[PDB]
Design a protein around this motif. Structure first.
Motif, short mmCIF file in Angstrom:
data_model
loop_
_atom_site.label_atom_id
_atom_site.label_comp_id
_atom_site.label_asym_id
_atom_site.label_seq_id
_atom_site.Cartn_x
_atom_site.Cartn_y
_atom_site.Cartn_z
N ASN A 2 0.84 -1.19 0.00
CA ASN A 2 0.00 0.00 0.00
C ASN A 2 0.88 1.24 0.00
O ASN A 2 1.92 1.26 0.66
CB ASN A 2 -0.85 0.04 1.27
N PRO A 3 0.51 2.30 -0.71
CA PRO A 3 1.17 3.58 -0.51
C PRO A 3 0.67 4.22 0.77
O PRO A 3 -0.32 3.75 1.36
CB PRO A 3 0.72 4.39 -1.73
N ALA A 47 -5.12 -2.34 -0.34
CA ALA A 47 -4.94 -3.25 -1.46
C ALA A 47 -4.50 -4.64 -1.01
O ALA A 47 -4.74 -5.62 -1.73
CB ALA A 47 -3.93 -2.67 -2.46
N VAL A 48 -3.84 -4.74 0.14
CA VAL A 48 -3.45 -6.05 0.67
C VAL A 48 -4.65 -6.75 1.28
O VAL A 48 -4.90 -7.93 1.00
CB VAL A 48 -2.30 -5.90 1.68
N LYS A 49 -5.41 -6.04 2.11
CA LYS A 49 -6.61 -6.62 2.68
C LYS A 49 -7.58 -7.07 1.59
O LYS A 49 -8.07 -8.21 1.61
CB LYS A 49 -7.31 -5.64 3.62
N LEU A 50 -7.86 -6.19 0.64
CA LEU A 50 -8.89 -6.42 -0.36
C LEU A 50 -8.41 -7.23 -1.56
O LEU A 50 -9.23 -7.53 -2.43
CB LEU A 50 -9.47 -5.08 -0.84
N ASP A 54 -3.34 -4.48 -8.07
CA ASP A 54 -3.23 -3.48 -9.12
C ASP A 54 -3.94 -2.17 -8.81
O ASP A 54 -3.88 -1.26 -9.64
CB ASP A 54 -3.74 -4.05 -10.45
N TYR A 55 -4.57 -2.03 -7.64
CA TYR A 55 -5.37 -0.84 -7.39
C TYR A 55 -4.55 0.43 -7.52
O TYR A 55 -4.94 1.37 -8.23
CB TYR A 55 -6.06 -0.88 -6.03
N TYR A 56 -3.40 0.49 -6.86
CA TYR A 56 -2.55 1.66 -6.89
C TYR A 56 -1.60 1.65 -8.08
O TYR A 56 -0.89 2.64 -8.30
CB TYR A 56 -1.80 1.81 -5.57
N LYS A 57 -1.59 0.58 -8.87
CA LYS A 57 -1.00 0.66 -10.20
C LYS A 57 -1.88 1.44 -11.15
O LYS A 57 -1.37 2.00 -12.13
CB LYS A 57 -0.73 -0.73 -10.76
N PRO A 62 -5.57 8.61 -5.07
CA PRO A 62 -6.64 7.96 -4.30
C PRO A 62 -7.35 8.96 -3.40
O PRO A 62 -6.79 9.97 -2.98
CB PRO A 62 -5.91 6.91 -3.48
N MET A 63 -8.63 8.67 -3.14
CA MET A 63 -9.40 9.50 -2.22
C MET A 63 -10.56 8.68 -1.66
O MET A 63 -11.08 7.79 -2.32
CB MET A 63 -9.91 10.78 -2.89
N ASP A 64 -10.95 9.00 -0.43
CA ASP A 64 -12.03 8.29 0.24
C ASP A 64 -12.68 9.24 1.25
O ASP A 64 -12.11 10.27 1.62
CB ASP A 64 -11.49 7.08 0.98
N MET A 65 -13.86 8.85 1.73
CA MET A 65 -14.61 9.73 2.63
C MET A 65 -14.02 9.81 4.03
O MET A 65 -14.29 10.79 4.73
CB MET A 65 -16.08 9.30 2.69
N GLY A 66 -13.25 8.81 4.47
CA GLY A 66 -12.58 8.94 5.75
C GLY A 66 -11.52 10.02 5.71
O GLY A 66 -11.43 10.86 6.62
N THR A 67 -10.75 10.05 4.63
CA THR A 67 -9.80 11.14 4.42
C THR A 67 -10.50 12.49 4.34
O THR A 67 -10.08 13.46 4.97
CB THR A 67 -9.01 10.87 3.14
N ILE A 68 -11.59 12.57 3.56
CA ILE A 68 -12.32 13.83 3.43
C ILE A 68 -12.84 14.30 4.79
O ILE A 68 -12.71 15.47 5.14
CB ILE A 68 -13.45 13.70 2.40
#
Ligand SMILES: Cc1nnc2ccc(NCCc3c[nH]c4ccccc34)nn12
Ligand code: NA
Ligand code: NA
Length: 124
Positions: A2-3, A47-50, A54-57, A62-68
């Motif tokens: 993961n990044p 990406a490791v859990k899920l 290739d997600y971050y490839k 990336p963005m998500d509502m927890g970050t927001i």
């Protein structure tokens, strides 16, 4: 691999509190958060859990509502448009990584329509 997740603070970035940004947290974010389809978007993609190696490839901003949510709580943004751009990035990342008709895309489509409904009229 993961990044690191997107930053939620940045001491050299200027901060602002506005009526529209308060509304984006109190009303827009907190309403979307409770939707039946919000859960895949409440935290950065792991990406490791899920098992998405290739997600971050594919997804470079990336963005998500927890970050927001954390950005709004920290007064990270200068204006409402900057926060709206983060929601738009979150939705478009989902469309990019997946394809039409996928269950997760149907979820994003419904959340995007609710989001647009809520930001159609903002406080002055
Ligand atoms: C966020 C995001 N954006 N693209 C993706 C791709 C996968 C993903 N896994 C989350 C768990 C899950 C796997 N299948 C589903 C179908 C619908 C809703 C959620 C899931 N999240 N994801
Ligand atoms: Na795609
Ligand atoms: Na509104």
């Amino acid at each position: 691999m993961n990044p690191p997740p997107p930053e939620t603070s940045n001491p050299n970035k200027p901060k602002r509190q506005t009526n529209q940004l308060q509304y984006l947290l109190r009303v827009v974010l907190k309403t979307l958060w409770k939707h039946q389809f919000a859960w895949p978007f409440q935290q950065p993609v792991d990406a490791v859990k899920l098992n998405l190696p290739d997600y971050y490839k594919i997804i470079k901003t990336p963005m998500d509502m927890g970050t927001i949510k954390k950005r709004l709580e920290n007064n990270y943004y200068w204006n409402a448009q900057e926060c709206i751009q983060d929601f738009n990035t979150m939705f478009t990342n989902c469309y990019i990584y997946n394809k039409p008709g996928d269950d997760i895309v149907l979820m994003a489509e419904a959340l995007e329509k609710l989001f647009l409904q809520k930001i159609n009229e903002l406080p002055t």
